[PDB]
Design a binder for these strands. Structure first.
Length: 462
DNA sequence: AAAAAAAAAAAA
């Protein structure tokens, strides 16, 4: 057991990790110095017959459902394959924007196919990381030694590689490795600091709530116009999510926090910028310590870089001093999150991963499912406590092993498909394709893609 | 040991 990194990327048929499906997965394993270990893998996932890909996604990836169907395996097999790669001990699974996207795909694919949704990222000394915020952090805090493309800095891999003398899912993986190498070379101490601080316990320690100790925070939510950076201070741990802390963005306008009550603050917080009119935005942001957030002591952002980024230290310090003497603000921000309407998921079991953890007993039961021949599942004498499992099991069987359904199950699946491919859904889908063909009438390649999508839909619904 | 869905923020 030697420590390795497993760089990876998915291409999918849509943006929703629960309701859309993966098309392709690519991975490359390296040692701690980013020398390639073994052989790159890239493989496709065959979409089940109750799904149509989002046209926008296919135009981005160039991957048709026909293509994935032809050279992919079903999702049960696609899941097992990735699961075996991910659960090699002492693996740090990472990518580029994976925490907010690819990792969610992983969790849901495991969930739908009876694998633990999270163990790949913690068990047997595994962990995860994400190079996107590393690049953003390097640009904001220690940009020396690297060339940063702009027009506003860009963090697209293609732009980042071109600007630093460096040469598709597999392509993205190779490029992510190259940026990792670069930053480790030019800013080894920042790199190692970020790597060690992927651990939520090192992060948690930086937060001091009673003191409102200020920190620098680099986040895509701050925006390129300020180099994704600001000084923040913790107001309270989130009342419902123990892995979230409520931060004030010290660079913002704290008026609303002092003036408004929690109900108006909540309303305002979830108001679109373009709907705010006269009113100041609420300068509150959640930091999720289990999501590899970039946090460091306040002085990690040098005055020269605050200046470069257009961030005003005295303004932040001013806000901080005022907040420290207005503790009533803490109560109010917690209320924004504590007194909100609970989130009720839809009755679609695909969307219920976050309803709760499964028990040890259910895990044992799911383990047996995975060890049973599909043809023998119907005869499987077993019982489940979590009410999601029977629903997941029916979907699992119908999507992956349709030959194993009895007549009544066949009829149920037929009704499910009809309830998906309604005349209203099919017409929305037709109108989207027609709109896109118009938008791209001059582009032979995209038009052929849109034609494939129409043909796939026609086939699947007849 | 593991989590939180959407809203909004941002970038794609």
């Amino acid at each position: 057991q030697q420590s390795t990194f497993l760089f990876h990327d998915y291409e999918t048929f849509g943006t929703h990790p629960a309701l859309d499906r993966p098309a392709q997965f690519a991975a490359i394993r390296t040692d701690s110095e980013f020398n390639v270990i073994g052989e790159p893998e890239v493989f496709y996932c065959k979409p089940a017959d109750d799904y149509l890909p989002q046209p926008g996604a296919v135009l981005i990836t160039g991957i048709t459902p026909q293509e994935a169907r032809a050279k992919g395996e079903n999702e049960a097999a696609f899941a097992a394959r990735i699961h075996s790669l991910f659960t090699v001990p002492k693996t740090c699974i990472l990518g580029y924007n994976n925490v907010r996207f690819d990792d969610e795909v992983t969790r849901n694919i495991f969930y739908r196919n009876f694998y633990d949704p999270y163990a790949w990222s913690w068990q047997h000394d595994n962990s995860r990381w994400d190079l996107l915020d590393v690049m953003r952090a390097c640009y904001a805090l220690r940009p020396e030694g690297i060339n940063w493309p702009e027009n506003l800095p860009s963090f697209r891999l293609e732009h980042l590689t071109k600007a630093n003398g460096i040469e598709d899912a597999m392509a993205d993986v190779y490029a992510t490795i190259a940026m990792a190498k670069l930053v480790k070379t030019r800013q080894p101490r920042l790199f190692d600091y970020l790597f060690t601080h992927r651990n939520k316990h090192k992060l948690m320690a930086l937060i001091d709530v009673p003191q409102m100790k200020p920190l620098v925070h680099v986040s895509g939510m701050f925006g390129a116009w300020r180099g994704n950076t600001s000084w923040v201070a913790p107001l309270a741990w989130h009342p419902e999510n123990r892995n979230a802390v409520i931060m004030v963005d010290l660079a913002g306008d704290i008026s609303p926090l002092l003036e408004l009550d929690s109900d108006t603050l909540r309303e305002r917080l979830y108001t679109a910028k373009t709907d705010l009119g006269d009113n100041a935005a609420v300068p509150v942001k959640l930091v999720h310590i289990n999501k590899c957030p970039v946090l460091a002591q306040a002085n990690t952002l040098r005055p020269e870089d605050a200046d470069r980024l257009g961030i005003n230290r005295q303004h932040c310090l001013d806000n901080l001093k005022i907040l420290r003497e207005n503790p009533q603000v803490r109560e109010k921000v917690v209320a924004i999150f504590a007194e909100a309407e609970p989130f009720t998921p839809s009755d679609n079991v695909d969307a219920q991963l976050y309803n709760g953890f499964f028990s040890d007993a259910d895990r044992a039961a799911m383990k047996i499912v995975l060890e049973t021949e599909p043809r023998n599942l119907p005869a499987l004498d077993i019982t489940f406590v979590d009410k999601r499992i029977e629903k997941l099991l029916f979907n699992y069987r119908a999507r992956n092993f349709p030959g194993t359904l009895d007549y009544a199950e066949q009829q149920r699946w037929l009704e499910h498909r009809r309830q998906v491919f309604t005349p209203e859904f099919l017409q929305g889908y037709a109108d989207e394709l027609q709109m896109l063909v118009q938008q791209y009438a001059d582009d032979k390649e995209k038009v052929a893609l849109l034609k494939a999508l129409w043909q796939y839909a026609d086939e699947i619904v007849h």
